[PDB]
Each structure stands twice: as C-alpha cells, then as structure tokens.
Amino acid sequence: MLQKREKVLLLRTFQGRTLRIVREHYLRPCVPCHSPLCPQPAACSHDGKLLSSDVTHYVIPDWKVVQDYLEILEFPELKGIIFMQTACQAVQHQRGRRQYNKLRNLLKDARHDCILFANEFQQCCYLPRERGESMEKWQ
Amino acid sequence: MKETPLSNCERRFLLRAIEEKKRLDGRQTYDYRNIRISFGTDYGCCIVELGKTRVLGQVSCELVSPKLNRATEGILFFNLELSQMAAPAFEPGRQSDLLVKLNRLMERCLRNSKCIDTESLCVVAGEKVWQIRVDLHLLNHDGNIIDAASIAAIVALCHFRRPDVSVQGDEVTLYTPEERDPVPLSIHHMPICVSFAFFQQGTYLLVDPNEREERVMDGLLVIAMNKHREICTIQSSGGIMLLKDQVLRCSKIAGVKVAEITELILKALENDQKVRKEGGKFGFAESIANQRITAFKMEKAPIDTSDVEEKAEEIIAEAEPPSEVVSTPVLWTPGTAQIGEGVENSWGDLEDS
RNA sequence: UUUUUUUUUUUUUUUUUUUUUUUUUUCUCCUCUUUUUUUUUUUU
C-alpha cells in the first residue's frame, strides 16, 4: 500500500543551534477529493462535508491568496473553494495562530463551499525538490 | 554471607494455605498491614512502619543555577538506598539489579505524574533557583519495600517547608525562621503505589505480601494511581503471564486501596499540624512507648562539677618538667640541614670510585 | 519325570571485579474612549 519517503528539516533553536532532523512521509493511493463528480464513490466513500455542483468554475489560491487576502473569502456568495493542504501548512507555519484559527473555522463550517485536499498525501501529486530551488517556486 | 535457605515444608504449607485462602498472620486477601507514622522536629522527616518494615524519609533543598535550557523550573533529585542492616543479603555493591528497578519505579511515578509544582520554584531565571533532593533509606526488610517507600516519600514531601526570600527590583535577600516564617509547597495529587502477587500461575492473588509469601510467588504486578480515578504507572514484572480481565480487577483494587491510604495520610498530617499548633511537645523522643519493658527515660542531671579544678591543678603540678638537653642543627650547604646523632663525614665522595 | 547362567542409581569443586539524580526542540503575537490625574480636615 503506502510508500515511504523522507523529509529533512533545518530547525533553529533559541540558542542558535540548527540541526538536520530527518522525518517520515507516507503516500497513499486514494486521497478523497470531496467532489460530486468523482467517478468512483466507494474507493473513498466521501465521508465528510460534500459540495453540490452548481458553480461555473473553481478557484484555488496558490498559497498567498489565502495568506493575506483571506478576509475576502468568507462572503457566502463565493462558492466552490478548495484549499491545497500545502497552503494551509504554509499559513500555519508562517502566520501564527489567529489567521489559522479563522481559516480552520471557515473549513469547519457548513455555511460555505470550503473543503481541504491532501495534496501531500496523494501518490502522484507529491514532488521532491531539485537542484536550485526556493519554497515559493517548489510551492 | 547469605540469607538462610527455604525448606521444602514451608513451601508446601504456604501453598496449602493459599489454596485454602488463609494466610499466616490472619489477614484476609484484600487487606493491608496497619500503618503507623511518626514525625521528627525539623520539617520534612518521617518514619513510616508498614507491618514490620521501616523506611526513613528526609527532604532537603538548596539554591543552585539552573543548567542551560528550562530556565524557569527546578530540578528534583532522588536517591533510594538499601541499608546493610535491612537484611543479611544487602551488600554495598552486590545487589545492583534491585536498586535499578526500584529507583526507576519511584522516579517514573513521582516525576512523570507531575504532582509536585516545580513551576513556582524560581527566584530569577538564568540565576539561582531551588534544587530539592529527596532521600529514602530502608531500615528493616519485611517485604513490600515499594508501598512503604512511596508512602514515605509522599509524607516527607507533604510535610516539608521551604525557606523564603524577598525579591524586588534586581536585589536578593534570604530570611530565617525568626526573620520570616517557612513556607509550604504545592502538591497537585497523591500518587500511591500498590502491589499484587500472583500464586501458582495466576490462579490466586494476594494483596500486600510479606517476605515468606514473596519467596513462594511467581510474579508481581504494581499499579501506581493517584487519587480520584487516575492511573499513573503500571509495571508487570517477575515471572508472570497475564490475562486481560485481571489487569482491570487489579486497577479497581488499587483504586480502593489508594483511597483508604490517602484518607489515613491526610488524617495523620492533620493531627500532626494540630499538635504542632496547640503548643505541645513533639519529636522522636516523645513517641517512645512508656508502657513497654524496652524503654527508659531520664531527665537532666548536674553530675557534680565541683572538683575538676583541684584534680587538674595537682596533676599539672605533680609531674616532671621538660628536660634541658637541647639539640644542635648542622649545616651542610644551603638547602639541606640535619639534626640528630649526625653522620661522621661531611658527605660521601668517591666512596666506591 | 522340567536342570544351569545372564554386574549397576555422572566423576568434580577451596571463583577476581576499583560506580551514582537527569539525559534531547516548536515561531511572530492591535488591551476601545469624561479627564487633568484627586490629595487639607476630623472621628479607627
């Protein structure tokens, strides 16, 4: 089933000590996509909050459009939003706890069309870094 | 030396008893041997007696600099010890595979439960903070060392009283019991150990076993669980192979027993505080039974210190004065001098060449 | 009117040891509104 991979990290402690901690990562075949046009119900069974198809389109900020412009995306007229987990992780590890709590209340709410996607736990959407890079471009 | 061996008649008799559900000293299955606490005079010192076991607890604090990292807490030593006098076998460096499991049980219980409040033991950060240091000794071994050691550590920590300090601006000051009153500690909960013994492959169990019953058993189960209903450590050990209903039964039993033990401890500490506050006499001395053949008491006595001057004077006067042959020091060459019968020549030279 | 023979529970005991609580992370963070700030006085 799963496919092990690794992730190195460079944590800087308060005393000025950095370290190359290594950690894990487990991919999967079937990440639920929480959509009403998924061409196979059973494999994930969609056990959560589920959209209803009426919209014209679907808009996905890359990471920044939800980092700062978040205050826009609450209006109950906006419909058809899906968040890539990598943006959520960016905002969590970059914007403290207030913005993240607002985002997670947004998600945890049956009033809007917001869902979350496991970009990073799906087996062919994950990509490893390469020679010469940055968080923005990889992102 | 070693300890007396176990015969083959006592084993048969103990197992016939256990099969018949009757114990040596009369107490039924779910019982403890009754307890008896006694407090010293300076704070944080007690003597607990479970049955015929003795443990001595003594707490003591001291002010040090708090390592690097964890700049806003204090450290907490512990040191169990087994006294050569506890039993024949104990030997200062020949019983090194019981000390480890005992220190570990004690430390995991007391330090991982987070009942002592090591938050509020700072004065500055990066600077001097209090370093407490618990100390236990075993005096007489009669089985179940860890229940008694745990009750002892609990009472010793719940009877201590720190020094106390004034901190304002950037300036220190240290008081004393006459300048300022010693201060208590903050204790969240009361983690109290319980032990169970299993007999002939888990078919029977007996609560709180003594030393003969400890040599006719397969394995031991310990369940450390503070008041309310909250378990804090478990450690199966010995030779046992357990089921799943039994751990739960044991947890119930330990619940009951820790309830009763905490009742007792609270009552005893209360009585002790009442005695200390009324204004009566306390201490190890006024605890010795007087209704007993093996105790005797004697109040003070001036003996007669009327004669020592005369005796000393006559003794000094009545003995031979220092003599008066004075010796001479000889000088060979700056750096070395000799005193005594001396040597014939100035120094040796070409003695053999 | 049916003689004679077919061994049995391993030998051994008179070995030295000079340590010591723990142990190893988690980021920056919008404190709302009559004010200067009142003040003697006496009964505790």
Side-chain angles (χ1 to χ4, degrees):
Chain A
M1 221 185 282
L2 285 63
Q3 283 76 15
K4 171 183 177 294
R5 294 184 186 180
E6 279 201 10
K7 296 176 181 289
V8 75
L9 305 173
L10 305 180
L11 273 66
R12 184 203 89 78
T13 63
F14 285 164
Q15 292 82 240
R17 294 284 76 78
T18 54
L19 283 72
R20 296 179 73 193
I21 174 163
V22 306
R23 292 183 178 180
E24 201 81 359
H25 200 207
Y26 278 89
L27 280 299
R28 325 181 82 88
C30 74
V31 171
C33 59
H34 270 281
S35 169
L37 60 94
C38 184
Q40 58 190 29
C44 307
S45 170
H46 295 268
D47 202 330
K49 179 183 161 184
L50 177 54
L51 309 168
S52 178
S53 179
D54 68 338
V55 298
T56 62
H57 67 292
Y58 283 139
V59 56
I60 67 184
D62 55 21
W63 53 290
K64 68 189 85 63
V65 167
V66 73
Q67 197 166 188
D68 57 353
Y69 292 13
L70 176 62
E71 279 68 11
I72 308 165
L73 306 166
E74 291 82 351
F75 283 6
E77 292 72 344
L78 291 147
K79 292 181 291 183
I81 303 299
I82 62 181
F83 296 96
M84 292 305 80
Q85 177 194 2
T86 316
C88 284
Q89 285 189 2
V91 67
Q92 188 175 1
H93 297 290
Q94 261 286 358
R95 294 311 150 181
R97 205 166 260 102
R98 302 318 285 233
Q99 276 197 354
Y100 194 77
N101 275 301
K102 294 180 176 66
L103 191 144
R104 183 163 58 189
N105 268 27
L106 182 52
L107 274 296
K108 183 63 66 68
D109 182 357
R111 179 160 276 94
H112 299 86
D113 268 2
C114 318
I115 73 170
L116 178 47
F117 193 72
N119 189 359
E120 311 264 31
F121 296 156
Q122 169 49 258
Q123 187 175 2
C124 304
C125 315
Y126 180 73
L127 299 172
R129 294 259 293 284
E130 295 170 45
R131 294 288 295 163
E133 197 152 345
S134 73
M135 191 304 297
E136 297 78 356
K137 304 172 80 184
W138 176 70
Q139 183 53 251
Chain B
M1 66 183 179
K2 208 200 60 181
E3 189 266 350
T4 182
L6 193 78
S7 74
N8 279 325
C9 172
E10 299 150 90
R11 167 164 302 115
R12 297 206 276 285
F13 193 68
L14 289 177
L15 288 164
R16 282 184 61 205
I18 280 173
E19 269 179 336
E20 196 176 324
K21 184 174 73 175
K22 296 183 193 77
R23 298 166 78 171
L24 286 192
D25 54 0
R27 43 165 175 155
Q28 302 220 16
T29 316
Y30 315 105
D31 290 359
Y32 266 80
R33 294 163 295 175
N34 49 40
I35 312 160
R36 204 218 59 102
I37 315 164
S38 311
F39 300 89
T41 68
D42 53 358
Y43 296 100
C45 190
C46 78
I47 287 186
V48 183
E49 308 172 17
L50 174 76
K52 277 173 193 164
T53 312
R54 281 187 194 266
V55 192
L56 178 72
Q58 166 86 45
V59 191
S60 56
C61 76
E62 183 191 18
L63 187 64
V64 298
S65 290
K67 57 191 56 177
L68 207 63
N69 165 28
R70 313 265 195 74
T72 61
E73 287 197 356
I75 298 90
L76 261 69
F77 284 49
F78 289 89
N79 199 13
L80 184 43
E81 183 65 26
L82 305 187
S83 194
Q84 166 76 53
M85 61 174 288
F90 302 169
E91 187 285 313
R94 252 64 183 160
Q95 297 289 262
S96 297
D97 293 355
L98 201 55
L99 268 68
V100 296
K101 83 183 73 163
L102 290 203
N103 292 295
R104 290 321 202 280
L105 270 173
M106 210 57 37
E107 182 178 1
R108 69 178 65 251
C109 199
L110 285 171
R111 157 179 314 197
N112 296 6
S113 295
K114 279 172 185 179
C115 48
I116 190 166
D117 185 74
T118 187
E119 273 196 343
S120 57
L121 319 166
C122 288
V123 167
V124 178
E127 313 313 328
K128 320 184 283 293
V129 292
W130 284 129
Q131 174 191 256
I132 299 194
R133 179 181 175 99
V134 179
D135 274 336
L136 304 96
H137 313 261
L138 187 79
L139 306 171
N140 183 49
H141 178 74
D142 187 21
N144 213 341
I145 298 173
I146 56 170
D147 297 7
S150 79
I151 306 189
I154 296 298
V155 178
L157 271 166
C158 298
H159 179 267
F160 192 42
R161 291 181 184 270
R162 272 185 287 127
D164 185 349
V165 299
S166 167
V167 176
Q168 187 274 331
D170 63 358
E171 185 178 2
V172 186
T173 301
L174 275 293
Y175 294 102
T176 48
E178 59 273 59
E179 311 171 52
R180 277 296 270 280
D181 172 31
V183 65
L185 292 191
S186 183
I187 294 305
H188 312 139
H189 54 97
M190 310 214 88
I192 275 168
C193 283
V194 186
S195 310
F196 311 77
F198 292 105
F199 282 117
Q200 64 183 357
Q201 317 296 339
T203 50
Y204 296 106
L205 76 164
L206 288 186
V207 192
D208 184 44
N210 57 51
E211 196 272 330
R212 285 307 189 239
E213 307 173 8
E214 267 191 358
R215 306 177 91 180
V216 71
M217 80 188 182
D218 311 285
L220 194 85
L221 184 74
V222 178
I223 295 188
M225 65 179 288
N226 72 6
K227 183 67 174 66
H228 313 117
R229 295 284 162 177
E230 295 187 324
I231 297 165
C232 305
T233 73
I234 292 181
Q235 199 204 32
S236 177
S237 68
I240 186 59
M241 311 283 197
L242 286 146
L243 291 195
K244 194 99 172 54
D245 57 352
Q246 295 172 343
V247 182
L248 304 182
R249 194 177 314 117
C250 290
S251 183
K252 288 169 183 149
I253 300 303
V256 166
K257 293 317 164 178
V258 174
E260 295 170 337
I261 298 178
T262 304
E263 182 65 26
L264 262 60
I265 297 169
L266 290 180
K267 188 171 308 318
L269 275 163
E270 175 69 38
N271 176 18
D272 164 73
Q273 198 53 75
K274 180 260 297 177
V275 160
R276 274 181 192 256
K277 147 188 190 166
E278 201 54 36
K281 304 190 311 313
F282 50 85
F284 281 140
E286 195 81 333
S287 77
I288 288 182
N290 282 315
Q291 53 159 14
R292 276 193 172 187
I293 284 173
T294 53
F296 198 68
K297 315 193 81 53
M298 180 151 292
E299 53 276 57
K300 288 195 296 188
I303 47 169
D304 215 29
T305 186
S306 45
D307 263 8
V308 299
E309 170 62 21
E310 199 197 41
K311 293 169 165 61
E313 173 62 27
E314 57 90 18
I315 286 180
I316 193 66
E318 193 204 306
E320 302 295 327
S323 82
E324 307 300 1
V325 298
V326 68
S327 299
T328 313
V330 187
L331 201 47
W332 289 132
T333 290
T336 56
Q338 209 170 2
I339 71 166
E341 297 158 7
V343 71
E344 188 45 36
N345 289 5
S346 301
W347 289 99
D349 63 357
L350 171 146
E351 217 60 21
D352 59 25
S353 58

PDB file of all heavy atoms in Angstrom, chain B residues 169-184:
ATOM      1  N   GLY B 169      12.858  44.797  42.527  1.00  0.00           N
ATOM      2  CA  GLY B 169      13.898  45.351  41.678  1.00  0.00           C
ATOM      3  C   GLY B 169      14.828  44.278  41.140  1.00  0.00           C
ATOM      4  O   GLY B 169      14.391  43.272  40.575  1.00  0.00           O
ATOM      5  N   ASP B 170      16.130  44.493  41.317  1.00  0.00           N
ATOM      6  CA  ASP B 170      17.137  43.488  40.995  1.00  0.00           C
ATOM      7  C   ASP B 170      17.981  43.064  42.195  1.00  0.00           C
ATOM      8  O   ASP B 170      19.208  42.959  42.087  1.00  0.00           O
ATOM      9  CB  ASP B 170      18.037  43.997  39.862  1.00  0.00           C
ATOM     10  CG  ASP B 170      18.818  45.248  40.238  1.00  0.00           C
ATOM     11  OD1 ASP B 170      18.642  45.762  41.362  1.00  0.00           O
ATOM     12  OD2 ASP B 170      19.614  45.719  39.398  1.00  0.00           O
ATOM     13  N   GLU B 171      17.344  42.797  43.335  1.00  0.00           N
ATOM     14  CA  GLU B 171      18.069  42.600  44.581  1.00  0.00           C
ATOM     15  C   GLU B 171      17.496  41.411  45.339  1.00  0.00           C
ATOM     16  O   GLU B 171      16.280  41.200  45.371  1.00  0.00           O
ATOM     17  CB  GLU B 171      18.002  43.856  45.460  1.00  0.00           C
ATOM     18  CG  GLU B 171      18.834  43.783  46.729  1.00  0.00           C
ATOM     19  CD  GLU B 171      18.782  45.068  47.530  1.00  0.00           C
ATOM     20  OE1 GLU B 171      18.066  46.002  47.110  1.00  0.00           O
ATOM     21  OE2 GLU B 171      19.455  45.144  48.578  1.00  0.00           O
ATOM     22  N   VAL B 172      18.396  40.641  45.942  1.00  0.00           N
ATOM     23  CA  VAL B 172      18.060  39.406  46.626  1.00  0.00           C
ATOM     24  C   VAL B 172      18.019  39.683  48.126  1.00  0.00           C
ATOM     25  O   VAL B 172      18.501  40.707  48.604  1.00  0.00           O
ATOM     26  CB  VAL B 172      19.066  38.275  46.260  1.00  0.00           C
ATOM     27  CG1 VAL B 172      18.654  36.923  46.838  1.00  0.00           C
ATOM     28  CG2 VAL B 172      19.235  38.186  44.750  1.00  0.00           C
ATOM     29  N   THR B 173      17.446  38.746  48.888  1.00  0.00           N
ATOM     30  CA  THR B 173      17.628  38.671  50.334  1.00  0.00           C
ATOM     31  C   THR B 173      17.068  37.343  50.831  1.00  0.00           C
ATOM     32  O   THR B 173      16.044  36.871  50.335  1.00  0.00           O
ATOM     33  CB  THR B 173      16.918  39.833  51.056  1.00  0.00           C
ATOM     34  OG1 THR B 173      17.436  41.087  50.592  1.00  0.00           O
ATOM     35  CG2 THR B 173      17.117  39.746  52.564  1.00  0.00           C
ATOM     36  N   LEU B 174      17.757  36.756  51.811  1.00  0.00           N
ATOM     37  CA  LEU B 174      17.450  35.438  52.350  1.00  0.00           C
ATOM     38  C   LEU B 174      17.107  35.558  53.828  1.00  0.00           C
ATOM     39  O   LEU B 174      17.894  36.105  54.608  1.00  0.00           O
ATOM     40  CB  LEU B 174      18.640  34.484  52.184  1.00  0.00           C
ATOM     41  CG  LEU B 174      18.873  33.696  50.892  1.00  0.00           C
ATOM     42  CD1 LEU B 174      17.771  32.673  50.682  1.00  0.00           C
ATOM     43  CD2 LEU B 174      18.995  34.615  49.686  1.00  0.00           C
ATOM     44  N   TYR B 175      15.939  35.052  54.212  1.00  0.00           N
ATOM     45  CA  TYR B 175      15.456  35.179  55.577  1.00  0.00           C
ATOM     46  C   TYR B 175      15.815  33.930  56.383  1.00  0.00           C
ATOM     47  O   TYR B 175      16.525  33.037  55.910  1.00  0.00           O
ATOM     48  CB  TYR B 175      13.950  35.443  55.587  1.00  0.00           C
ATOM     49  CG  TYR B 175      13.550  36.772  54.990  1.00  0.00           C
ATOM     50  CD1 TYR B 175      13.034  36.854  53.705  1.00  0.00           C
ATOM     51  CD2 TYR B 175      13.672  37.945  55.724  1.00  0.00           C
ATOM     52  CE1 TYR B 175      12.661  38.067  53.163  1.00  0.00           C
ATOM     53  CE2 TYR B 175      13.303  39.163  55.191  1.00  0.00           C
ATOM     54  CZ  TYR B 175      12.798  39.219  53.911  1.00  0.00           C
ATOM     55  OH  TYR B 175      12.430  40.432  53.375  1.00  0.00           O
ATOM     56  N   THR B 176      15.298  33.856  57.605  1.00  0.00           N
ATOM     57  CA  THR B 176      15.478  32.725  58.503  1.00  0.00           C
ATOM     58  C   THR B 176      14.232  32.604  59.367  1.00  0.00           C
ATOM     59  O   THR B 176      13.492  33.581  59.531  1.00  0.00           O
ATOM     60  CB  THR B 176      16.727  32.891  59.387  1.00  0.00           C
ATOM     61  OG1 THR B 176      16.741  34.198  59.970  1.00  0.00           O
ATOM     62  CG2 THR B 176      18.011  32.664  58.597  1.00  0.00           C
ATOM     63  N   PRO B 177      13.957  31.401  59.927  1.00  0.00           N
ATOM     64  CA  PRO B 177      12.686  31.167  60.635  1.00  0.00           C
ATOM     65  C   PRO B 177      12.310  32.200  61.692  1.00  0.00           C
ATOM     66  O   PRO B 177      11.140  32.282  62.080  1.00  0.00           O
ATOM     67  CB  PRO B 177      12.909  29.791  61.271  1.00  0.00           C
ATOM     68  CG  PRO B 177      13.769  29.096  60.285  1.00  0.00           C
ATOM     69  CD  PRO B 177      14.728  30.150  59.786  1.00  0.00           C
ATOM     70  N   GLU B 178      13.273  32.987  62.170  1.00  0.00           N
ATOM     71  CA  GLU B 178      12.957  34.095  63.066  1.00  0.00           C
ATOM     72  C   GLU B 178      12.695  35.393  62.315  1.00  0.00           C
ATOM     73  O   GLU B 178      11.915  36.228  62.789  1.00  0.00           O
ATOM     74  CB  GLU B 178      14.083  34.299  64.084  1.00  0.00           C
ATOM     75  CG  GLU B 178      15.443  34.601  63.482  1.00  0.00           C
ATOM     76  CD  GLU B 178      16.217  33.341  63.145  1.00  0.00           C
ATOM     77  OE1 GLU B 178      15.710  32.524  62.351  1.00  0.00           O
ATOM     78  OE2 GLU B 178      17.336  33.170  63.675  1.00  0.00           O
ATOM     79  N   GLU B 179      13.337  35.587  61.163  1.00  0.00           N
ATOM     80  CA  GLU B 179      13.096  36.769  60.343  1.00  0.00           C
ATOM     81  C   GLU B 179      11.839  36.615  59.497  1.00  0.00           C
ATOM     82  O   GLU B 179      11.080  37.576  59.328  1.00  0.00           O
ATOM     83  CB  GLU B 179      14.307  37.073  59.460  1.00  0.00           C
ATOM     84  CG  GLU B 179      15.633  37.084  60.198  1.00  0.00           C
ATOM     85  CD  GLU B 179      16.819  37.178  59.259  1.00  0.00           C
ATOM     86  OE1 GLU B 179      16.828  38.089  58.402  1.00  0.00           O
ATOM     87  OE2 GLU B 179      17.738  36.341  59.372  1.00  0.00           O
ATOM     88  N   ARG B 180      11.592  35.414  58.974  1.00  0.00           N
ATOM     89  CA  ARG B 180      10.391  35.136  58.201  1.00  0.00           C
ATOM     90  C   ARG B 180      10.027  33.664  58.311  1.00  0.00           C
ATOM     91  O   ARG B 180      10.893  32.797  58.461  1.00  0.00           O
ATOM     92  CB  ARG B 180      10.591  35.486  56.719  1.00  0.00           C
ATOM     93  CG  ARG B 180      10.382  36.939  56.340  1.00  0.00           C
ATOM     94  CD  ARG B 180       8.953  37.379  56.564  1.00  0.00           C
ATOM     95  NE  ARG B 180       8.152  37.142  55.367  1.00  0.00           N
ATOM     96  CZ  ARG B 180       8.147  37.929  54.300  1.00  0.00           C
ATOM     97  NH1 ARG B 180       8.892  39.022  54.244  1.00  0.00           N
ATOM     98  NH2 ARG B 180       7.374  37.614  53.264  1.00  0.00           N
ATOM     99  N   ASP B 181       8.730  33.401  58.234  1.00  0.00           N
ATOM    100  CA  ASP B 181       8.155  32.095  58.529  1.00  0.00           C
ATOM    101  C   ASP B 181       8.357  31.161  57.338  1.00  0.00           C
ATOM    102  O   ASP B 181       8.117  31.568  56.196  1.00  0.00           O
ATOM    103  CB  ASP B 181       6.665  32.242  58.850  1.00  0.00           C
ATOM    104  CG  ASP B 181       5.948  30.908  58.979  1.00  0.00           C
ATOM    105  OD1 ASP B 181       6.576  29.917  59.403  1.00  0.00           O
ATOM    106  OD2 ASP B 181       4.742  30.855  58.656  1.00  0.00           O
ATOM    107  N   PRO B 182       8.812  29.926  57.559  1.00  0.00           N
ATOM    108  CA  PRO B 182       8.959  28.986  56.443  1.00  0.00           C
ATOM    109  C   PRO B 182       7.638  28.756  55.724  1.00  0.00           C
ATOM    110  O   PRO B 182       6.557  28.879  56.303  1.00  0.00           O
ATOM    111  CB  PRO B 182       9.447  27.712  57.132  1.00  0.00           C
ATOM    112  CG  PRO B 182      10.296  28.237  58.237  1.00  0.00           C
ATOM    113  CD  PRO B 182       9.553  29.464  58.747  1.00  0.00           C
ATOM    114  N   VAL B 183       7.740  28.411  54.444  1.00  0.00           N
ATOM    115  CA  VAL B 183       6.588  28.383  53.546  1.00  0.00           C
ATOM    116  C   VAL B 183       6.341  26.960  53.049  1.00  0.00           C
ATOM    117  O   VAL B 183       7.299  26.201  52.844  1.00  0.00           O
ATOM    118  CB  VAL B 183       6.816  29.367  52.381  1.00  0.00           C
ATOM    119  CG1 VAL B 183       7.993  28.925  51.514  1.00  0.00           C
ATOM    120  CG2 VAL B 183       5.564  29.563  51.534  1.00  0.00           C
ATOM    121  N   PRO B 184       5.077  26.551  52.852  1.00  0.00           N
ATOM    122  CA  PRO B 184       4.799  25.175  52.414  1.00  0.00           C
ATOM    123  C   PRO B 184       5.078  24.971  50.934  1.00  0.00           C
ATOM    124  O   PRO B 184       5.593  25.874  50.266  1.00  0.00           O
ATOM    125  CB  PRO B 184       3.313  24.993  52.747  1.00  0.00           C
ATOM    126  CG  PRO B 184       2.753  26.359  52.730  1.00  0.00           C
ATOM    127  CD  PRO B 184       3.843  27.253  53.249  1.00  0.00           C
TER     128      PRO B 184
END
